[PDB]
Design a protein around this nucleic acid. Structure first.
Lengths: 225, 34, 62, 216, 109, 124, 128, 4
RNA sequence: GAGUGGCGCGGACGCUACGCCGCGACGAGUAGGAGGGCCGCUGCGGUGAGCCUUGAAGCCUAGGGCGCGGGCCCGGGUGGAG
RNA sequence: CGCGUCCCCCGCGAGCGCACGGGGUCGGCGGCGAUGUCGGCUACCCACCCGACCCGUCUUGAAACACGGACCAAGGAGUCUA
């Protein structure tokens, strides 16, 4: 006589409540383990180099898995092939940013649109703030802000990417579900570089802004983010 | 959530290191009196 | 400045019937409610057909 | 039955406790403090007896009401706001009230009150300024500080004491309180050479004098 | 008594070359001639004091003919102690090269 | 039925009055007096009217009876309430809640009656 | 002791000047009433600098404060006493206005009735 | 049931 | 999700469903095309117990407004019959 | 951070309160005002700064030393039939 369905509706609420606490603890401990990974990742590159240097040899480090490509040129007076490659990168606007994992079918595209992009190998802190500050998800093909973990957990949960930290781990350490985790991210709406561009029209090598800037994308990510 | 724990650990670490640095500077001043 | 071709960013379907008859328009109000609420994909296809022109819902012979 | 305690983990950063929730569960004794599972009043009438109603239904509803507005959190009232000082406004500093009817007058600071406003006393002898409040923003703090720590400011001259009630007439209480505080400060300003005269003089910008260049 | 404000000159508006934005003024405060010395004046209150034909009220006074457009020193302009100000009404171009009073009393010292 | 003879009336009734980007309905039993399905005072089986009296003071409450709806003359029972304001607004609440008589128009009728007792109150 | 609306929001307007027609200044034959310039070399049409502005949809007023008077009400235009009871339940949002060609004796009824119903009138003192 |  | 089994008479708003609400993205434009006009004009069928010699149409306006706009509503003056 | 029990090495406790927590509030105040001041974005006149060539038109291209236009009112051009 309602004594049953009083408590039964509470028993539901408690089971919903205790389940979030278990999901919170997992998110907390996945975040603690990636800290332990990034440490070991950062440490072993210095370690392998020191033992190369002790022996008198060289540790040629792993050619990078992951690039961050920023469009530097505008939308006006652009080649048809360059238009296509820029819009397959989802760089459809000036100072739009996307992560692009390196291979042969990546770089022969990035070298073909060299004059229209400034790209390089992003940091861990660069991948953090780009995902934290500028992080927007393509949910129902709508640019919805990543403010709770239940937007990444709902779209990317089937790949066990169930929080903001899992996404950062998936991008930086280019995971088996990088494509689905990176295509989830809307092309990053970055502001104009606060400090100034050197020269938009010429390559970075010849005192410009365009093309591959290996370590140096991070200085302009912080200039723009 | 783990961010709070990481930040607290970093701040405590930094304070410890600053105290150590101050102690080393005091030892240097003692040597520079000797 | 975003390179978006605004050619095909208006979908040219019916979102109501062009007819002003109130017996057909009351049937739409009923299947507006059923189609979206009932998860059955039947009522959605019926609602679409209630909109369609005389030519697009031709007379089915007995 | 249990009386409240002060929070055990100290505030390392704003919104962070110094101890983790394993170092805290430890301190709070939760390892040994476990736990398992209005309206109507009857009045007499001299007839029958009535059941009268506390907060009864209204006689008038207007033609349209506004809806209940959403719940924001960090928006306290002014009585609950945190009250900041400048670190240059120390109890004993001599200020320069910039904007008042007493504009430019060099004035002895007393204490930050319980409403953000500075209790200030430019001696009514010297400046011709009473017991008066001033705002921090409309007041320059100088490198001119008297040893005020050991003068007993009265308790009763508070924020509500100086609030405008409604031709203003000075209450004879306000005249005693001026003389009560002036008897403690004004001997200790004469202790410093040429300070009694400095308070008398008014502040003035002049030719070739730029406020960013005079460092004070 | 004495002067409680600093001598600034309405040295034109915030402008490119072939476009001016009348909402922001460019103030030349006397004495400060670098970005190092313009830091004191940021957030300070700036008054364009003029007088007209008709009397208007005076707050804590009898009606003068003197009037004001109150403003605020928003941020530094350029490399040479010029400063941006933003007035509640856009300053009239009558005032170009005339005296506006950068006050002291959004004071931080 | 209600939903049928709405679709005839909705745009072409004699009571419908459009100007100044605003639409009203000057019907005998519309209260809030706006062009709506809910508030239309011709088209529903159960309709609540709140009008001032044929004399100066009071509120009459028009309850459209269930039976003779094709009978315009006998279709409405009119009850004048000449009491204090608090118990006039009560009576109208009890006619609608505790007869279940079109409970969507419970608060609109009490707000109307309130604005009629306010109208017949003398201005200073 | 005037009538208050329900909400009195800050009526923010994107532009208060009229969109006067191009070359309405030079000619008397050309009225101030706006007409889009559709000429092949027109400065105003093809957005030249320091020229007459064209009405875009961008200048559209906020939907909440659209048609809202300086008083914070909307107008509803009234011909007779019977068209006021229309406004007796939309009282705090929409105010009455008596039409120009309503007679001197008939305003005196509509002004006096709007006093009873607490309906605001924009032009109550108009014949006397 | 662990915290009973 | 259902079954036999071991006192206080109370609760805002709403939903012209051709209505209302929410969320993302986008907005040059000639020729040209389409849509929406509670844009305007003059006649007809309806309707508004519409307005009008206690002053219609028209006309003027350094008056008050509204609408992104086409335009429109008011106040004052003139006017005499819609 | 229990144990009632299941084994590889030797399913609901009650409260309280603070808030870097799903978009602003103050439980802060202060000057003024009936014959000279207050408000009025627009509208009237004037001044200043920046911008700013004269429209229609055919044209690859018009402010053009291309053509039409002194000025104003009224009239004036995709119709109806098949």
């Amino acid at each position: 006589n309602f004594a049953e369905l009083k408590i039964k509706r509470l028993r539901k609420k408690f089971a919903q409540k205790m389940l979030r606490k278990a999901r919170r603890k997992l998110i907390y401990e996945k975040a603690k383990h990636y800290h332990k990974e990034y440490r070991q990742m950062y440490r072993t590159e210095i370690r392998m180099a020191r033992m190369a240097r002790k022996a008198g040899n060289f540790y040629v480090p792993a050619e990078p898995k992951l690039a961050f490509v920023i469009r530097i040129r505008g939308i006006n007076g652009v080649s048809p092939k360059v238009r296509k490659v820029l819009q397959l990168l989802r760089l459809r606007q000036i100072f739009n940013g996307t992560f692009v994992k390196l291979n042969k079918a990546s770089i022969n595209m990035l070298r073909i649109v060299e004059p229209y992009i400034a790209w390089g190998y992003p940091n861990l802190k660069s991948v953090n703030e780009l995902i934290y500050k500028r992080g927007y998800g393509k949910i129902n093909k709508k640019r919805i802000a990543l403010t709770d973990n239940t937007l990444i957990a709902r779209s990317l949960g089937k790949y066990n990417i169930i929080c903001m930290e899992d996404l950062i781990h998936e991008i930086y350490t280019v995971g088996k579900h990088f494509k689905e985790a990176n295509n989830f991210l809307w092309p990053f709406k970055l502001s104009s570089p606060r400090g100034g561009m050197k020269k938009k029209t010429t390559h970075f090598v010849e005192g410009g802004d365009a093309g591959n800037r290996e370590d140096q994308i991070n200085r302009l990510i912080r200039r723009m983010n | 959530p783990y961010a709070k724990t990481m930040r607290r650990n970093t701040i405590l670490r930094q304070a410890r290191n600053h105290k150590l640095r101050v102690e080393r500077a005091a030892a240097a001043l003692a040597a520079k009196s000797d | 400045g975003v390179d978006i071709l605004h050619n095909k960013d208006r979908k040219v379907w019916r979102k109501e019937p062009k007819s002003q008859d109130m017996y057909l328009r009351l049937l739409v109000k009923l299947y507006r409610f059923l189609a979206r609420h009932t998860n059955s994909t039947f009522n959605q296809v019926v609602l679409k057909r209630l909109f369609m022109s005389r030519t697009k819902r031709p007379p089915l012979s007995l | 039955k249990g009386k409240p305690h002060c929070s055990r983990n100290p505030v390392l950063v704003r919104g962070i406790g110094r101890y983790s929730r394993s170092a805290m569960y430890s301190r709070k004794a939760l390892y040994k403090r476990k736990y398992a599972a209005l309206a109507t009043v009857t009045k007499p009438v001299g007839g029958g007896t009535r059941v009268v109603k506390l907060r009864k239904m209204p006689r008038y509803y207007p033609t349209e009401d506004v809806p209940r507005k959403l719940l924001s959190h960090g928006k306290k009232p002014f009585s609950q706001h945190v009250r900041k000082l400048r670190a240059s406004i120390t109890p004993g500093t001599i200020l320069i009230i910039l904007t008042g009817r007493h504009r430019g007058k060099r004035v002895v600071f007393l204490k930050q009150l319980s409403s953000g406003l500075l209790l200030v006393t430019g001696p009514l002898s010297l400046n011709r300024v009473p017991l008066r409040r001033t705002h921090q923003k409309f007041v320059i703090a100088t490198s001119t500080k008297i040893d005020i720590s050991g003068v007993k400011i009265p308790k009763h001259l508070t924020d509500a004491y100086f609030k405008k009630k409604k031709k203003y007439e000075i209450t004879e209480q306000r005249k005693v309180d001026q003389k009560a505080v002036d008897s403690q400060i004004l001997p200790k300003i004469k202790a410093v050479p040429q300070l009694q005269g400095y308070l008398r003089s008014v502040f003035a910008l002049t030719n070739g004098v730029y406020p960013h260049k005079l460092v004070f | 008594s004495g002067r409680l404000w600093c001598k600034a000159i309405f040295a034109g508006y915030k402008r490119g070359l072939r476009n001016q934005r009348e909402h922001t003024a460019l103030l030349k405060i006397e004495g400060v001639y670098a970005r190092d010395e313009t830091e004191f004046y940021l957030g300070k209150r700036c008054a364009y004091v003029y007088k007209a034909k008709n009397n208007t009220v005076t707050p804590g006074g009898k009606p003068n003919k003197t009037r004001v457009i109150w403003g605020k020193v928003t941020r530094a302009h350029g490399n040479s102690g010029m400063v941006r100000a933003k007035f509640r009404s856009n300053l009239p171009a009558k005032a170009i090269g005339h005296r506006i009073r950068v006050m002291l009393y959004p004071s931080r010292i | 039925s209600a939903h049928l003879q709405w679709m005839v009336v909705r745009n072409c009734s004699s009571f419908l009055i459009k100007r100044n980007k605003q639409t009203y309905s000057t019907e005998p039993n519309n209260l809030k007096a706006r062009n709506s399905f809910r508030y239309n005072g011709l088209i529903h089986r159960k309709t609540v009217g709140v009008e001032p009296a044929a004399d100066g003071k009071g509120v009459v409450v028009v309850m459209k009876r269930r039976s003779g709806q094709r009978k315009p003359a006998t279709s409405y029972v009119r009850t004048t309430i000449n009491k204090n304001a608090r118990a006039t607004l009560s009576s109208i609440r009890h006619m609608i809640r505790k007869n279940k008589y079109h409970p969507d128009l419970r608060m609109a009728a009490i707000r109307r009656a309130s604005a009629i007792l306010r109208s017949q109150k003398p201005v200073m | 002791a005037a009538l208050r609306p329900l909400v009195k929001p800050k009526i923010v307007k994107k532009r208060t000047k009229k969109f006067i027609r191009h070359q309405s200044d030079r000619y008397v034959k050309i009225k101030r009433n706006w007409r889009k310039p559709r000429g092949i070399d027109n400065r105003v049409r093809r957005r030249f600098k320091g020229q007459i502005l064209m009405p875009n949809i961008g200048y559209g007023s906020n939907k909440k404060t659209k048609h809202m008077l300086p008083s914070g009400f909307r107008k509803f235009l009234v011909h007779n006493v019977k068209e006021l009871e229309v406004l007796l339940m939309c009282n705090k949002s929409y105010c009455a206005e008596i039409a120009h060609n309503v007679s001197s004796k008939n305003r005196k009824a509509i002004v006096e009735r709007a006093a009873q119903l607490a309906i605001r009138v924009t032009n109550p003192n108009a014949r006397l | 049931r662990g915290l009973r």
